[PDB]
Design a protein around this motif. Structure first.
Motif, PDB file in Angstrom:
ATOM      1  N   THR A 185     -16.913  17.642  -5.815  1.00  0.00           N
ATOM      2  CA  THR A 185     -16.803  18.798  -5.037  1.00  0.00           C
ATOM      3  C   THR A 185     -16.891  17.850  -2.972  1.00  0.00           C
ATOM      4  O   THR A 185     -17.553  19.157  -3.013  1.00  0.00           O
ATOM      5  N   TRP A 186     -16.554  16.988  -2.927  1.00  0.00           N
ATOM      6  CA  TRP A 186     -17.127  16.349  -1.740  1.00  0.00           C
ATOM      7  C   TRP A 186     -15.561  16.589  -0.997  1.00  0.00           C
ATOM      8  O   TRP A 186     -15.789  15.502   0.108  1.00  0.00           O
ATOM      9  N   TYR A 187     -14.534  16.993  -1.258  1.00  0.00           N
ATOM     10  CA  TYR A 187     -13.674  17.419  -0.060  1.00  0.00           C
ATOM     11  C   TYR A 187     -13.529  19.534  -0.032  1.00  0.00           C
ATOM     12  O   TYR A 187     -13.948  19.633   0.115  1.00  0.00           O
ATOM     13  N   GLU A 188     -11.975  19.010   1.138  1.00  0.00           N
ATOM     14  CA  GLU A 188     -12.033  20.549   1.983  1.00  0.00           C
ATOM     15  C   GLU A 188     -12.361  21.966   1.316  1.00  0.00           C
ATOM     16  O   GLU A 188     -12.791  22.697   1.957  1.00  0.00           O
ATOM     17  N   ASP A 189     -11.637  21.508  -0.232  1.00  0.00           N
ATOM     18  CA  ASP A 189     -11.120  22.539  -0.003  1.00  0.00           C
ATOM     19  C   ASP A 189     -11.338  22.932  -1.958  1.00  0.00           C
ATOM     20  O   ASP A 189     -12.158  22.249  -1.970  1.00  0.00           O
ATOM     21  N   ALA A 190     -10.748  23.951  -2.783  1.00  0.00           N
ATOM     22  CA  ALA A 190     -10.623  23.545  -3.990  1.00  0.00           C
ATOM     23  C   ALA A 190     -11.189  23.474  -5.011  1.00  0.00           C
ATOM     24  O   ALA A 190     -12.007  22.589  -5.202  1.00  0.00           O
ATOM     25  N   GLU A 226     -10.793  10.383  -8.863  1.00  0.00           N
ATOM     26  CA  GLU A 226      -9.997   8.823  -9.333  1.00  0.00           C
ATOM     27  C   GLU A 226      -9.769   8.877  -7.397  1.00  0.00           C
ATOM     28  O   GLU A 226      -9.777   9.452  -6.801  1.00  0.00           O
ATOM     29  N   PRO A 227      -9.000   8.009  -7.786  1.00  0.00           N
ATOM     30  CA  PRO A 227      -8.319   7.025  -5.780  1.00  0.00           C
ATOM     31  C   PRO A 227      -7.255   8.119  -5.712  1.00  0.00           C
ATOM     32  O   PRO A 227      -6.394   8.462  -7.091  1.00  0.00           O
ATOM     33  N   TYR A 228      -6.610   9.270  -4.780  1.00  0.00           N
ATOM     34  CA  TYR A 228      -6.318   9.751  -4.135  1.00  0.00           C
ATOM     35  C   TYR A 228      -5.721  11.011  -5.351  1.00  0.00           C
ATOM     36  O   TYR A 228      -5.510  11.072  -6.371  1.00  0.00           O
ATOM     37  N   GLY A 229      -7.311  11.625  -5.189  1.00  0.00           N
ATOM     38  CA  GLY A 229      -7.557  12.248  -6.265  1.00  0.00           C
ATOM     39  C   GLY A 229      -6.817  13.293  -7.030  1.00  0.00           C
ATOM     40  O   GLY A 229      -6.731  14.046  -5.957  1.00  0.00           O
ATOM     41  N   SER A 230      -5.701  13.215  -7.689  1.00  0.00           N
ATOM     42  CA  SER A 230      -4.496  14.043  -8.036  1.00  0.00           C
ATOM     43  C   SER A 230      -4.737  14.608  -9.942  1.00  0.00           C
ATOM     44  O   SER A 230      -5.602  14.252 -10.645  1.00  0.00           O
ATOM     45  N   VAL A 231      -4.088  16.000  -9.887  1.00  0.00           N
ATOM     46  CA  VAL A 231      -3.847  16.408 -11.279  1.00  0.00           C
ATOM     47  C   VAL A 231      -2.309  15.634 -11.696  1.00  0.00           C
ATOM     48  O   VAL A 231      -1.859  16.290 -11.020  1.00  0.00           O
ATOM     49  N   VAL A 232      -2.051  15.426 -12.213  1.00  0.00           N
ATOM     50  CA  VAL A 232      -0.515  15.722 -13.043  1.00  0.00           C
ATOM     51  C   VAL A 232       0.031  17.178 -13.625  1.00  0.00           C
ATOM     52  O   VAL A 232       0.234  16.663 -13.082  1.00  0.00           O
ATOM     53  N   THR A 257      -8.124  11.101   3.463  1.00  0.00           N
ATOM     54  CA  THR A 257      -9.621  10.454   3.294  1.00  0.00           C
ATOM     55  C   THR A 257      -8.586   9.603   1.957  1.00  0.00           C
ATOM     56  O   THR A 257      -8.374  10.547   1.105  1.00  0.00           O
ATOM     57  N   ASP A 258      -9.062   8.643   1.602  1.00  0.00           N
ATOM     58  CA  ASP A 258      -9.009   7.630   0.697  1.00  0.00           C
ATOM     59  C   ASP A 258      -9.254   7.061   0.071  1.00  0.00           C
ATOM     60  O   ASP A 258     -11.082   6.895   0.024  1.00  0.00           O
ATOM     61  N   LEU A 259      -9.471   6.589  -1.234  1.00  0.00           N
ATOM     62  CA  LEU A 259     -10.174   5.509  -2.204  1.00  0.00           C
ATOM     63  C   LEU A 259     -10.380   4.277  -0.960  1.00  0.00           C
ATOM     64  O   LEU A 259     -11.600   3.716  -0.446  1.00  0.00           O
ATOM     65  N   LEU A 306     -20.820   5.341   6.417  1.00  0.00           N
ATOM     66  CA  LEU A 306     -20.478   6.050   5.821  1.00  0.00           C
ATOM     67  C   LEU A 306     -20.817   7.456   5.345  1.00  0.00           C
ATOM     68  O   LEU A 306     -22.113   6.632   5.748  1.00  0.00           O
ATOM     69  N   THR A 307     -20.212   8.605   5.199  1.00  0.00           N
ATOM     70  CA  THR A 307     -21.902   9.819   5.107  1.00  0.00           C
ATOM     71  C   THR A 307     -22.193   9.501   2.938  1.00  0.00           C
ATOM     72  O   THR A 307     -21.847   9.018   2.903  1.00  0.00           O
ATOM     73  N   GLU A 308     -22.752  10.766   3.757  1.00  0.00           N
ATOM     74  CA  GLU A 308     -23.436  11.012   2.260  1.00  0.00           C
ATOM     75  C   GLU A 308     -22.453  10.611   0.582  1.00  0.00           C
ATOM     76  O   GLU A 308     -22.167  10.006  -0.028  1.00  0.00           O
ATOM     77  N   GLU A 309     -22.133  12.420   1.305  1.00  0.00           N
ATOM     78  CA  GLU A 309     -20.752  12.600   0.410  1.00  0.00           C
ATOM     79  C   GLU A 309     -19.429  11.704   0.075  1.00  0.00           C
ATOM     80  O   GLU A 309     -19.071  11.448  -1.275  1.00  0.00           O
ATOM     81  N   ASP A 310     -19.132  10.838   1.002  1.00  0.00           N
ATOM     82  CA  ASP A 310     -17.884   9.667   1.077  1.00  0.00           C
ATOM     83  C   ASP A 310     -19.085   8.194   0.444  1.00  0.00           C
ATOM     84  O   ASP A 310     -18.073   7.795  -0.943  1.00  0.00           O
ATOM     85  N   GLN A 311     -20.049   7.902   0.497  1.00  0.00           N
ATOM     86  CA  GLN A 311     -21.572   7.481  -0.402  1.00  0.00           C
ATOM     87  C   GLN A 311     -20.991   7.596  -1.831  1.00  0.00           C
ATOM     88  O   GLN A 311     -20.632   6.773  -2.303  1.00  0.00           O
ATOM     89  N   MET A 312     -21.486   8.991  -1.721  1.00  0.00           N
ATOM     90  CA  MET A 312     -21.356   9.056  -3.430  1.00  0.00           C
ATOM     91  C   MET A 312     -20.025   8.924  -3.578  1.00  0.00           C
ATOM     92  O   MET A 312     -19.862   8.746  -5.388  1.00  0.00           O
ATOM     93  N   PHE A 313     -19.250   9.514  -3.583  1.00  0.00           N
ATOM     94  CA  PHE A 313     -17.712   9.514  -3.948  1.00  0.00           C
ATOM     95  C   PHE A 313     -17.328   7.895  -4.244  1.00  0.00           C
ATOM     96  O   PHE A 313     -16.887   7.901  -5.166  1.00  0.00           O
ATOM     97  N   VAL A 314     -18.170   6.572  -3.735  1.00  0.00           N
ATOM     98  CA  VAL A 314     -17.403   5.282  -3.757  1.00  0.00           C
ATOM     99  C   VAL A 314     -17.960   4.800  -4.702  1.00  0.00           C
ATOM    100  O   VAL A 314     -17.189   3.775  -5.754  1.00  0.00           O
TER     101      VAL A 314
END
Lengths: 248, 301, 67
Positions: free
Chosen positions: B236-241, B248-254, B266-268, B281-289
């Motif tokens: 839940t740590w990206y701008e929209d959606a 996942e790296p380059y978080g995507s849904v096929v 904003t990539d892994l 990094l920020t808190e959301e970036d640290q939690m994502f990584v």
DNA sequence: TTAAATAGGGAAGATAAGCAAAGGGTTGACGAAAGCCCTTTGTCCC
DNA sequence: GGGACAAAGGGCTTTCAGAGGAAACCCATCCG
């Protein structure tokens, strides 16, 4: 075409696979003709023709670059440097199982021939190899051409060599016709003068080179005429088959 | 510059097992019966976009089905989950890059990640489309000889709960360096009598059947990859959606064909080699990584 | 054959085995199409040399007798 | 512990998307034909 | 004792020369 003797499933180890400078594999028909002549001279029984079939055969090593056998110091010219890895002088080896048919002219009895053959085989060689085991020989009698098929079929199972002749030369025929060459005789070049180092001082000596002919491998049950599968000495130092060039 | 090594990989820290399906009653959930698959043949029409000339022809297909019996009205899905520690430990390579990344990391808060991982199992996002058509879903979780029962709704918008916290704190301690912990998860549903269940499908080449379902000795089951995919849908740590997706790296849904976290800084891998190169990094970036490092994968090249 | 196969290479770099066997100049010289000056000298080298030490020796049937 | 007598015709078998990246592939031994020098043995001469 | 030849043996050796190259075939019957 009267009396035949069969010896099948003969195991020989350490066969000299090098028959010439360009042929590595099965010994030529000259080797078996010489074996038959040796049997005739040693045993005292006239042998007419010899037939050989390949049950199994394998050259030691891989698909290419067959093998090298380690050598040893055995000459009287060394003693100081004769302590590390004498040179090679390559000599390939192979292992095979064959089946032999011998045309014999003997009518004294029926069981003495088996014993006299078994006595010679126990102390014989095939192209320098050592015979491991063999089956008990048996004798077949042929009175005409129609029952020659039975004595032919008695040799199952094996692959027999038939002669197809040469068209131009072995190198072009092998690529085009897809057959394999074989040595059928020797051609004399020039006479030996000095008779010091030769193994015999009575037999005339000659320098000879092999002559090549193209052959084929056929199943025994698919042979049309059995006379095409028997080899014997010919004229001008050659080995030829009774039936001549094989034709379907 | 401290560039990433040619070969560098990490292992998986969350291990789920293949879930199994049983048919039980809502008031007699003691005795269980397995669910078989079977095979059927169907007939229908041909409706292909761009092929209207063959609209009057028939069509015969062979498929696999799976449904509850007519005397059982509850689907029980059971599995086990194992959490292991020793994160920030590279399996292949790493003598300075991994150590620098660990030093830049481990200052983040594992509490939120542990809370969300447990919530995704307690609320019931692990079980897929089998959710619809059910009026009551009950979750039973066993850990360290202590049973917990949940009837939590609203799988989206992770809210505060009391029973979830006392398992989330246990998982958080194990995440930042411990041995292992094990959870046993059971789910009960109220689909009804004779309702259809949806076991996981499998990839197959040309064959007689048009659709076959995963099974173990004839009993319908689910793939462990599918079970683990739903647990890590906490990004839940990206701008929209909103209504998040898996990490996942380059978080995507096929399935949708859209790729979030594209080439817009904003990539892994950009954050990984930017954290070690000075700026943190920020808190959301640290939690994502950290969350994506808990998930496996190979990085290098 | 020459001892140690040393020889001397040409300016582009060739030995006799390559030169005579490149485009059939051997037959062009043996017949005598290049003159009678390079024909006698080449034919002088074609001399026999007998050596039987460490060679195979086999008996072959030649009518009545062996060779 | 049975003799014979036959065992259906027609239609029809879906489509779309994708198959990953990075790192490395071993070493040692397998010569002939001489040149010179020294030693020993043996023959011959002085 | 000195000179010459041959053989055997060792060593001082050491002289001599030199980078192509690409891929899994042949073949089905007697006999209890």
């Amino acid at each position: 075409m009267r009396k035949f003797i069969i010896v099948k499933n003969v195991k020989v180890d350490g066969i000299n696979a090098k028959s010439s400078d360009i042929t590595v594999g099965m010994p030529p028909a000259t080797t078996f003709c010489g074996l038959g002549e040796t049997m005739s001279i040693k045993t005292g029984i006239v042998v007419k023709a010899v037939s050989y079939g390949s049950v199994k055969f394998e050259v030691r090593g891989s698909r290419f670059n067959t093998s090298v056998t380690k050598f040893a110091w055995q000459d009287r010219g060394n003693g100081g440097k004769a302590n590390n890895n004498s040179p090679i002088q390559p000599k390939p080896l192979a292992d095979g199982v064959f089946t032999l048919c011998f045309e014999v002219e003997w009518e004294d009895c029926a069981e003495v021939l088996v014993d006299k053959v078994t006595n010679f085989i126990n102390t014989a060689r095939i192209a320098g190899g050592t015979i491991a085991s063999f089956n008990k020989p048996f004798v077949k009698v042929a009175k005409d051409a129609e029952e020659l098929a039975s004595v032919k079929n008695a040799m199952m199972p094996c692959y027999v060599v038939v002669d197809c002749g040469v068209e131009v030369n072995i190198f072009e025929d092998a690529v085009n016709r897809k057959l394999q060459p074989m040595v059928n005789g020797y051609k004399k070049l020039e006479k030996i003068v000095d008779n010091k180092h030769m193994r015999d001082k009575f037999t005339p000596a000659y320098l000879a080179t092999p002559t090549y002919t193209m052959i084929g491998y056929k199943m025994v049950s698919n042979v049309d005429n059995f006379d095409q599968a028997l080899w014997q000495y010919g004229e001008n130092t050659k080995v030829k088959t009774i039936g001549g060039i094989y034709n379907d | 510059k401290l560039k990433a090594p040619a070969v560098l990989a990490y292992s998986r820290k969350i291990n789920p097992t293949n879930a199994l399906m049983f048919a039980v009653n809502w008031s007699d959930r003691d005795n269980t019966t397995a669910v078989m698959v079977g095979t059927k043949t169907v007939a229908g029409t041909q409706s292909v976009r761009g092929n209207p000339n063959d609209a009057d022809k028939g069509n015969i297909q062979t498929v696999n089905f799976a449904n509850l019996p007519h005397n059982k009205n509850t689907l029980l899905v059971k599995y086990n989950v194992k959490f292991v520690g020793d994160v920030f430990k590279a399996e292949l390579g790493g003598g300075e890059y991994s150590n620098t990344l660990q030093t830049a990391l481990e200052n983040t808060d594992f509490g939120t990640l542990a809370y969300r991982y447990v919530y995704n199992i307690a609320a019931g996002r692990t079980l897929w489309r089998n959710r619809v058509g059910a009026e009551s879903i009950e979750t039973v979780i066993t850990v360290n000889d202590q049973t917990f029962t949940f009837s939590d709704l609203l799988v989206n918008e992770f809210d505060e709960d009391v029973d979830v916290a006392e398992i989330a704190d246990m998982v958080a301690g194990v995440l930042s360096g411990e041995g292992f912990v094990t959870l046993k998860v059971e789910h009960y549903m109220l689909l009804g009598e004779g309702s259809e269940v949806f076991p996981s499908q499998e990839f197959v080449e040309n064959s007689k059947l048009s659709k076959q379902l995963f099974d173990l000795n004839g009993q319908a089951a689910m793939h462990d990859q599918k079970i683990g995919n739903a647990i890590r849908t906490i990004d839940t740590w990206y701008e929209d959606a909103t209504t998040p997706i898996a990490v996942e790296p380059y978080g995507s849904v096929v399935r949708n064909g859209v790729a979030y976290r594209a080439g817009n800084k904003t990539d892994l891998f950009t954050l990984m080699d930017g954290a070690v190169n000075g700026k943190s990094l920020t808190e959301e970036d640290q939690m994502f990584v950290t969350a994506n490092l808990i998930r496996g994968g190979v990085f290098g090249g | 054959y020459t001892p140690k196969s040393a020889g001397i290479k040409n300016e582009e770099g060739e030995n006799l085995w390559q030169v005579l066997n490149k485009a059939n100049m051997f037959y062009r010289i043996y017949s005598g199409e290049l003159g009678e000056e390079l024909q006698y000298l080449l034919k002088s080298c074609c001399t026999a040399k007998e050596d039987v030490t460490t060679l195979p020796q086999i008996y072959f049937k030649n009518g009545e007798g062996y060779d």
